[PDB]
Amino acid sequence: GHMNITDIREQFPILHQQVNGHDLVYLDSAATSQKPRAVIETLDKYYNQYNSNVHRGVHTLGTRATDGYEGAREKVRKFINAKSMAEIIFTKGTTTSLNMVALSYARANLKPGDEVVITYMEAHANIIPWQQAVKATGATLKYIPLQEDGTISLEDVRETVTSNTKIVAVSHVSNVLGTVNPIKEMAKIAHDNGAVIVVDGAQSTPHMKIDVQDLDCDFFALSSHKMCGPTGVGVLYGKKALLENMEPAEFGGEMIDFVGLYESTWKELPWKFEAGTPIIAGAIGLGAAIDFLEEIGLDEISRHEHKLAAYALERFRQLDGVTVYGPEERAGLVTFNLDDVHPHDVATVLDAEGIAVRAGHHCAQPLMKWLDVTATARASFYLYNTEEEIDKLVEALQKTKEYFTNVFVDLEHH
Amino acid sequence: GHMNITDIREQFPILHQQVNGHDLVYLDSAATSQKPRAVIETLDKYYNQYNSNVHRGVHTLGTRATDGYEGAREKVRKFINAKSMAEIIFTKGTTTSLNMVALSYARANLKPGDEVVITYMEAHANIIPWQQAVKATGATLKYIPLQEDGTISLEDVRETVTSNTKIVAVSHVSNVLGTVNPIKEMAKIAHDNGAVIVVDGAQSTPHMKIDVQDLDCDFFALSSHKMCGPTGVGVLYGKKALLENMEPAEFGGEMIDFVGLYESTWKELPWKFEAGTPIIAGAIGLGAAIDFLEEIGLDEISRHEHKLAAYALERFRQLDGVTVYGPEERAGLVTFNLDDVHPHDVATVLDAEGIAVRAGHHCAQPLMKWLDVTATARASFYLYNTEEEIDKLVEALQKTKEYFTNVFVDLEHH
Ligand SMILES: Cc1ncc(COP(=O)(O)O)c(CNc2co[nH]c2=O)c1O
Numbered sequence: 001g002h003m004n005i006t007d008i009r010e011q012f013p014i015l016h017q018q019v020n021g022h023d024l025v026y027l028d029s030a031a032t033s034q035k036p037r038a039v040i041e042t043l044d045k046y047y048n049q050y051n052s053n054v055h056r057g058v059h060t061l062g063t064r065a066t067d068g069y070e071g072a073r074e075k076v077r078k079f080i081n082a083k084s085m086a087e088i089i090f091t092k093g094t095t096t097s098l099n100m101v102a103l104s105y106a107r108a109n110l111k112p113g114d115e116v117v118i119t120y121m122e123a124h125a126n127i128i129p130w131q132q133a134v135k136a137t138g139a140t141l142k143y144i145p146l147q148e149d150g151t152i153s154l155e156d157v158r159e160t161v162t163s164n165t166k167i168v169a170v171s172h173v174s175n176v177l178g179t180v181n182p183i184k185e186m187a188k189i190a191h192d193n194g195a196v197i198v199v200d201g202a203q204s205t206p207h208m209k210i211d212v213q214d215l216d217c218d219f220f221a222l223s224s225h226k227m228c229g230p231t232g233v234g235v236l237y238g239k240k241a242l243l244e245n246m247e248p249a250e251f252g253g254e255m256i257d258f259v260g261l262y263e264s265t266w267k268e269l270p271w272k273f274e275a276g277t278p279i280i281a282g283a284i285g286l287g288a289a290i291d292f293l294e295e296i297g298l299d300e301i302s303r304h305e306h307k308l309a310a311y312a313l314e315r316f317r318q319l320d321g322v323t324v325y326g327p328e329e330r331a332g333l334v335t336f337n338l339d340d341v342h343p344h345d346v347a348t349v350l351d352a353e354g355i356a357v358r359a360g361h362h363c364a365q366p367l368m369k370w371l372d373v374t375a376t377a378r379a380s381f382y383l384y385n386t387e388e389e390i391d392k393l394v395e396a397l398q399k400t401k402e403y404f405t406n407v408f409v410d411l412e413h414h
Numbered sequence: 415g416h417m418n419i420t421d422i423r424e425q426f427p428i429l430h431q432q433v434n435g436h437d438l439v440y441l442d443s444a445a446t447s448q449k450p451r452a453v454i455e456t457l458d459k460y461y462n463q464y465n466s467n468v469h470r471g472v473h474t475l476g477t478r479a480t481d482g483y484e485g486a487r488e489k490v491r492k493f494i495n496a497k498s499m500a501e502i503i504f505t506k507g508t509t510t511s512l513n514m515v516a517l518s519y520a521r522a523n524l525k526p527g528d529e530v531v532i533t534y535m536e537a538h539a540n541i542i543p544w545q546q547a548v549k550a551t552g553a554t555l556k557y558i559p560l561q562e563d564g565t566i567s568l569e570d571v572r573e574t575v576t577s578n579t580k581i582v583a584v585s586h587v588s589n590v591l592g593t594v595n596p597i598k599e600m601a602k603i604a605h606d607n608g609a610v611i612v613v614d615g616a617q618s619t620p621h622m623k624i625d626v627q628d629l630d631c632d633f634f635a636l637s638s639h640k641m642c643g644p645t646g647v648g649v650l651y652g653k654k655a656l657l658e659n660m661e662p663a664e665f666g667g668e669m670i671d672f673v674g675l676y677e678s679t680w681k682e683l684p685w686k687f688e689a690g691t692p693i694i695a696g697a698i699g700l701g702a703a704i705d706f707l708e709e710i711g712l713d714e715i716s717r718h719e720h721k722l723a724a725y726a727l728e729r730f731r732q733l734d735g736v737t738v739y740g741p742e743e744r745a746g747l748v749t750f751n752l753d754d755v756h757p758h759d760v761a762t763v764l765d766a767e768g769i770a771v772r773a774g775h776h777c778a779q780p781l782m783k784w785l786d787v788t789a790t791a792r793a794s795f796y797l798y799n800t801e802e803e804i805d806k807l808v809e810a811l812q813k814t815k816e817y818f819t820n821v822f823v824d825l826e827h828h
Pocket residue numbers: 030031032093094095096123125126171173174175200201202203223224225234362363467667689690691692
């Protein structure tokens with residue numbers, strides 16, 4: 001109970017506005033999160049006081065910028081409990097990190113007969129890179145089936161992963177079902193079969209503590225914009241032994257050692273995988289966001305979101321004609337559908353009430369077809385959301401149902 | 415004479431500080447530029463008022479964020495005089511744009527016997543991607559020789575580019591020599607031989623007007639951090655007909671149309687080449703930087719930098735034992751070396767005087783070996799730099815020479 005939601009909301013200026021005459025109710029944090037004053041003012045101080053190119057150590061502003069950038073790297077390492085800063089690569093997001101794994105590891109380690117194993121609930125960022133990799137290498141793509149409640153059975157994992165499996169790619173938390181996957185046990189299974197494991201942690205990292213040494217994940221991808229950090233920056237973590245043997249996905253300055261006319265040698269880790277001028281301000285702001293979240297406490301955020309999710313599930317079960325997808329035990333989000341109402345109209349009406357939710361396929365079309373739906377609505381929570389906002393959401397959903405029912409009965413009257 | 419340098423400097427808060435007790439003299443804009451209040455406050459307003467994920471059009475903040483992002487795209491299109499927004503791809507920088515060209519165009523259009531033609535003055539971002547592409551395709555890499563003053567002869571271009579040349583990759587302006595290359599004539603030559611042309615415009619775009627239709631460049635890469643914009647964002651321009659036939663370099667959400675279990679289809683341009691959540695705030699800030707530069711006028715900035723460069727060249731010629739590299743007609747930078755003093759010590763002493771210059775190889779090792787030097791110093795100018803700062807630079811260089819000469823004569827005395 002260490003968490004004061006009023007004091008937390010006071011740090012996010014964007015929450016204190018009205019939309020369509022109604023107080024803003026932002027329930028779309030799984031799409032992107034909002035930023036506290038700490039992060040915005042960190043970007044401000046960088047651009048106002050010590051912006052310069054990094055990795056030169058020549059003048060004072062350059063030294064300060066380099067110190068900020070590499071200190072943010074160390075902050076990330078501590079945040080996910082990685083062994084070394086050499087295992088922390090700054091990218092532009094989760095998607096780019098997964099693409100780097102698929103390019104530099106998969107396409108170099110896949111032979112005909114090899115298997116890449118994913119799940120039906122994966123977002124598109126954790127699907128199409130593997131599709132392209134197996135198409136380029138002539139390998140085989142396989143899918144772990146899902147249970148009736150949208151969870152993954154460990155026996156299904158043991159059945160799908162075989163001696164020919166080299167890569168198992170799975171999300172830590174589903175951005176649609178809210179499912180928390182058994183990443184540690186799946187990693188043990190993949191290693192038992194001689195495969196590596198690649199964890200999509202875009203949805204888990206902002207909301208729960210990450211320990212890559214306890215997870216024993218071989219790769220782990222995360223996105224800054226979902227965890228109160230700036231846009232356009234993310235992290236690829238990989239075990240140092242694996243990253244040492246992988247060739248770079250991008251080539252250019254800053255990642256080189258010697259450059260001949262036709263041949264070149266690369267820098268050591270992690271700079272081998274960071275070509276060109278890096279995302280300096282964004283990485284420093286991600287470090288600031290990590291400081292913010294850690295001072296609040298990721299366990300506290302997790303418990304707050306558990307309370308929010310249980311409350312939301314109970315209040316959704318109080319609504320007639322509403323279908324919620326996923327398991328009971330879940331992260332802080334609810335994907336649903338109103339009977340007789342397309343989710344786009346639901347979210348339009350909700351925005352008219354000032355409530356921001358997402359409508360569509362949520363970048364998971366195979367999962368949508370597994371759910372036998374064309375689209376869904378989704379309300380997602382974070383550390384600044386309250387139970388009163390969920391009350392507003394469910395009241396607006398009831399009003400939406402009533403409104404569309406009575407629009408139906410008047411046009412039938414005609 | 416429309417340019418008031420005092421009013422311009424008033425917009426950059428980072429310039430108004432002291433380093434080591436001396437007023438800051440920032441002459442390292444070729445490494446990275448500083449930002450005006452317009453850009454920083456644009457980022458501030460985004461994160462404070464309408465941050466949300468884009469390309470959904472579902473709630474109001476999302477619509478505002480999408481409008482800002484795509485409006486920044488249109489601003490870029492107008493800025494470089496591209497025909498269509500479909501030809502404007504947001505990347506994380508020039509290096510990534512050139513790597514995308516090398517991955518999606520070069521590696522798909524190079525056969526054994528084909529030629530990729532570059533120059534000795536290219537930065538590493540415009541060298542190593544082509545090295546890797548020709549190594550992957552078994553093609554051949556060739557270099558256009560340079561004149562005695564660091565310029566490129568059009569006859570040397572016609573000699574190097576042949577009927578087997580498919581790609582000519584060249585920088586618009588050298589970040590070391592200050593040379594402005596004849597990009598339009600080289601494009602005509604490359605097209606005459608059946609090749610496309612890829613322009614590295616990282617150093618030209620911030621300081622001179624770009625017209626890709628007059629240049630007739632097939633690809634053009636630029637970086638936001640060098641043109642008063644945020645870090646971690648850049649642009650790849652490509653002719654629409656070429657981009658339509660190129661496969662994506664990255665795969666994931668937002669760039670897809672249909673996603674099956676094993677096959678996928680891509681979005682139309684430009685979103686085909688933008689996977690995952692884009693660099694929303696950075697792109698909007700780049701649009702703000704474009705607004706700033708265009709209200710000042712790129713021709714005015716170019717003339718101011720021409721005045722600065724002529725003044726700096728004359729004052730450098732007044733110094734004994736100083737070697738300047740490159741031609742007389744040049745962009746706004748001076749790369750040089752002090753006799754008997756390593757450039758790292760030069761730049762250390764200069765930072766002790768509050769002057770920020772760069773020392774090293776400037777990501778151009780083949781050029782350094784062509785210059786028969788191991789490292790150089792470089793002072794680069796932008797719209798906020800004055801002639802008084804160049805006076806401070808040359809006075810500090812004279813003081814540095816005297817200091818090292820008399821440190822030499824006292825240790826010889828011993
Ligand atoms: C589980 C998961 N993986 C990967 C990604 C992609 O991350 P990015 O590269 O930073 O974009 C997302 C973002 N998912 C969503 C973005 O918008 N709505 C969403 O549900 C995600 O939720």
